[PDB]
């Protein structure tokens, strides 16, 4: 339990810190989404190499049985 | 003996058209446009009890990150089918959609 | 007195908003890191599958090369 | 026409535990602890110019986000990858109970934070 003037003065302060935090949280999410774009790109490049290998694997096994 | 396979939202059959199926049948599947392979195989199998066994072997592709000068609310994520709310010249929204062997935003950024 | 109560009520609603904006950004950052970790772990396992397949390929070409070389040797032997 | 001893790599280690090498010699490598495969070709190959040919097939593993510190702040100085360090701080009027720093280290075939999040207590 606090006075109305006292509570409002600390809610105002907390609002300032939350604004600064959110502004930071949005730089970190931006960098995270950019990171995920890279790792997903690395995943697509894996399936490209993997698919080439399996086509070769399938053709190899066909010439043996 | 299995019946028709279930309808997946992320994959369709790769070498058959859509009947009954023998036990041990293994249908190969392909990820629908806007999805990417997330498991080493992409198969549905008919088990001894006449049911289809499979897990979720595709996942949503993700659009790239969307800054609006003098004015972007990501309500969910950047995944296929998600929407961003954009100050006022242009479009107010944009959706991650299939765009030429990949995904992309429906509309570019608006003018503030 | 009436102004102070109206000021406190306004800023309490303002801090309740900013708390939600951070909470939604926090969960969105957490889900974006778990999703990265999902792919990173899948790729580490997927490279193992890649390597097992390459080993199979190397063995396949080896068995094939040894087969044609033995067949050529017997055909050359029959011709002598 | 011959390669010398292979260079020592900071991101990978040779799979084999000779001083001259013939053109075409391929040596296989694996990523070091704290690293992860980023390419299909994890090999060094003796080129006809006498130099080993290779790319960087390993990249840093990444630690997950530490989490939010109640009544405090977590400073990500550089990144969240292997070798990097984060700093902890408490808000005014709170005391820090625990470590003020944490490093992304090798933890059981993966990466993790050396020290856990501290407690900011009044
Ligand atoms: K590659």
Author numbering:
A (entry chain D): 46 to 110
B (entry chain B): 1 to 18, 21 to 68, 70 to 74, 76 to 90, 92, 98 to 122
C (entry chain C): 46 to 125
D (entry chain A): 0 to 16, 20 to 124
Authors' text:
Antigenically sequence variable M proteins of the major bacterial pathogen Streptococcus pyogenes (Strep A) are responsible for recruiting human C4b-binding protein (C4BP) to the bacterial surface, which enables Strep A to evade destruction by the immune system. M proteins form parallel, dimeric α-helical coiled coils which are attached to the bacterial cell wall and extend ∼500 Å into the extracellular space. The most sequence divergent portion of M proteins, the hypervariable region (HVR), is responsible for binding C4BP. We identified C4BP-binding in several M proteins that lack an M2 or M22 pattern, and determined the structures of two, M68 and M87 protein HVRs, in complex with C4BPα1-2.
The structure of the complex between M87N100 and C4BPα1-2 was determined by molecular replacement to 2.7 Å resolution limit. The structure revealed the same global architecture observed previously, with two C4BPα1-2 molecules bound by dimeric, α-helical M87N100. The two M87 helices (aa 46–110 and 46–125) were asymmetric, with one less coiled than the other. Each C4BPα1-2 molecule contacted predominantly one of the two M87 helices, which we termed the “major” helix and the other the “minor” helix. The interface was dominated by negatively charged M protein amino acids interacting with positively charged C4BP ones, supplemented with a few hydrophobic contacts. The C4BPα2 quadrilateral as a whole was not involved in interaction, except for R64, which formed hydrophobic contacts using its aliphatic chain with M87 Y81 of the major helix and a salt bridge with D80 of the minor helix; Y81 was the only core a or d position amino acid involved in contacts. In contrast to the C4BPα2 quadrilateral, the C4BPα1 Arg39 nook had the same role as previously observed in the M2 pattern, forming hydrophobic contacts and a salt bridge to M protein. Here, the former was to M87 W92 of the major helix and the latter to D96 of the minor helix. Relative to WT M87 protein, Y81A, E89A, and D96A bound C4BP ∼21-fold less well on average, which indicated that the hydrophobic contact to C4BP R64 and polar contacts to K63 and R39, respectively, were crucial. With LL-37, the two M87 α-helices splay apart and no longer form a coiled coil in order to accommodate α-helical LL-37, which inserts between the two M87 helices, whereas with C4BP, the two M87 α-helices formed a coiled coil.
